[PDB]
Each structure stands twice: as C-alpha cells, then as structure tokens.
Enzyme design. Structure first.
Site, short mmCIF file in Angstrom:
data_model
loop_
_atom_site.label_atom_id
_atom_site.label_comp_id
_atom_site.label_asym_id
_atom_site.label_seq_id
_atom_site.Cartn_x
_atom_site.Cartn_y
_atom_site.Cartn_z
N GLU A 173 1.13 5.09 19.17
CA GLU A 173 1.24 4.58 17.80
C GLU A 173 1.27 5.70 16.80
O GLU A 173 2.19 5.84 15.98
CB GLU A 173 0.03 3.67 17.52
CG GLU A 173 0.24 2.34 18.18
CD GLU A 173 -0.96 1.53 18.42
OE1 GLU A 173 -0.70 0.47 19.01
OE2 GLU A 173 -2.13 1.93 18.17
N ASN A 206 8.47 0.39 7.94
CA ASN A 206 9.26 -0.57 8.71
C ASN A 206 10.45 -1.05 7.91
O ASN A 206 10.44 -1.11 6.65
CB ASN A 206 8.36 -1.75 9.10
CG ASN A 206 7.07 -1.33 9.80
OD1 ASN A 206 5.94 -1.65 9.37
ND2 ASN A 206 7.22 -0.65 10.87
N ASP A 210 11.53 -3.99 7.15
CA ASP A 210 11.25 -5.12 6.27
C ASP A 210 10.47 -4.77 4.99
O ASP A 210 10.10 -5.69 4.21
CB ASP A 210 10.50 -6.19 7.05
CG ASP A 210 9.08 -5.77 7.43
OD1 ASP A 210 8.66 -4.62 7.20
OD2 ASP A 210 8.39 -6.58 8.03
N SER A 222 7.43 -3.35 4.97
CA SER A 222 6.06 -3.11 5.32
C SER A 222 5.89 -1.70 5.88
O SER A 222 6.87 -1.00 6.15
CB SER A 222 5.57 -4.11 6.33
OG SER A 222 6.23 -3.88 7.54
N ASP A 226 3.16 0.64 8.63
CA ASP A 226 2.05 0.71 9.57
C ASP A 226 1.11 1.84 9.22
O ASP A 226 1.61 2.91 8.89
CB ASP A 226 2.63 0.97 10.98
CG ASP A 226 3.45 -0.19 11.52
OD1 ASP A 226 3.36 -1.34 11.11
OD2 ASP A 226 4.20 0.10 12.44
N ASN A 243 -0.13 -3.10 10.45
CA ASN A 243 0.98 -3.37 9.54
C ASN A 243 0.56 -4.10 8.27
O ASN A 243 -0.24 -5.02 8.29
CB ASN A 243 2.02 -4.16 10.30
CG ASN A 243 3.23 -4.40 9.52
OD1 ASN A 243 3.30 -5.41 8.90
ND2 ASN A 243 4.08 -3.46 9.40
N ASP A 246 -5.17 -12.81 17.53
CA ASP A 246 -4.27 -13.66 16.70
C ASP A 246 -3.42 -14.62 17.55
O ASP A 246 -2.90 -15.58 17.02
CB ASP A 246 -3.39 -12.77 15.77
CG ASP A 246 -2.63 -13.55 14.64
OD1 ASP A 246 -3.29 -14.28 13.88
OD2 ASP A 246 -1.37 -13.38 14.53
#
Ligand code: CL
Ligand code: CL
Ligand code: CL
Ligand code: CL
Ligand code: NA
EC number: 3.2.1.17
Length: 129
Positions: free
Chosen positions: A35, A46, A48, A50, A52, A59, A101
C-alpha cells in the site's frame, strides 16, 4: 514515519490487528508494505477524485474526510490527515471498520493482489511479537 517491517508488525499487534476479522497479522503487514511501503505519510490520488492515506492507504471516498472528495462519506469519523500520523492508531482503528464492512481485506487492492493467498506469515518472520 517509514516503519520497519517488524516495527509495524508490533504496532499493528498492539493496536489489535492480529487475527482481526480472522486476518492474521502478516496480512496487515503485507498489505501495508504494498500500500504505502510502510510509510505513514503516503498519499495516492484516485481517478474518482478520492485519495488514499497512510500506512494502510485508507480512502477518502468512504472512510475519512479530506475536504476535497465531494459526496463522500467519512465512516471512520476522522480527517484523512489523522491517517498520516507516525502513530498508526487512527489508521488501525479505521482499518478495523473497513475490514468489517462486508468485503474483508479485499477492500485493499494491494492486499488482494499481493497478499491474499500468499504466505503472509513471512511478513512477521523474525519479529518479537
Ligand atoms: Cl474531518
Ligand atoms: Cl503506532
Ligand atoms: Cl473476511
Ligand atoms: Cl501471519
Ligand atoms: Na470522505
């Protein structure tokens, strides 16, 4: 902070990630290596819009607030800058939410691609745990 491997293992263990949702500690150390390269300061935008953040690349679309991801959630109730701290408490607590989640550690692309199905116990080899 750029953790060493066992240093990160110990930190993740003390903060309760070892076997958390059935993911042995090596899974978490493995995922952090790929990561963030064990770097708490890591950020990666990212497509979109967003980003991280941190050792576990959490995120801003769902998990943390970074003030520039419109119509995102902040399910960990933290600023994404909290995730960049040398102290990984916030990152670990948020990771626990993520992995709970529905999708387990598949939430982390680096884990799915580099850690899932591999000998992740290797990542905690040698560590005094
Ligand atoms: Cl915030
Ligand atoms: Cl820590
Ligand atoms: Cl699972
Ligand atoms: Cl392990
Ligand atoms: Na957000």
């Amino acid at each position: 902070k750029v953790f060493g491997r066992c240093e990160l293992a110990a930190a993740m263990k003390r903060h309760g990630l070892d076997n958390y949702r059935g993911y042995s500690l090596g899974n978490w150390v493995c995922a952090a290596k790929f990561e963030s390269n064990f770097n708490t300061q890591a950020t990666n935008r990212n497509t979109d819009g967003s980003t991280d953040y941190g050792i576990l690349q959490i995120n801003s679309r769902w998990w943390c607030n970074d003030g520039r991801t419109p119509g995102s959630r902040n399910l960990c109730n933290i600023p994404c800058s909290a995730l960049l701290s040398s102290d990984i408490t916030a990152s670990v607590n948020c990771a626990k939410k993520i992995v709970s989640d529905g999708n387990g550690m598949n939430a982390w692309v680096a884990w799915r691609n580099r850690c899932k199905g591999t000998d992740v116990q290797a990542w905690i080899r040698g560590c005094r745990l």
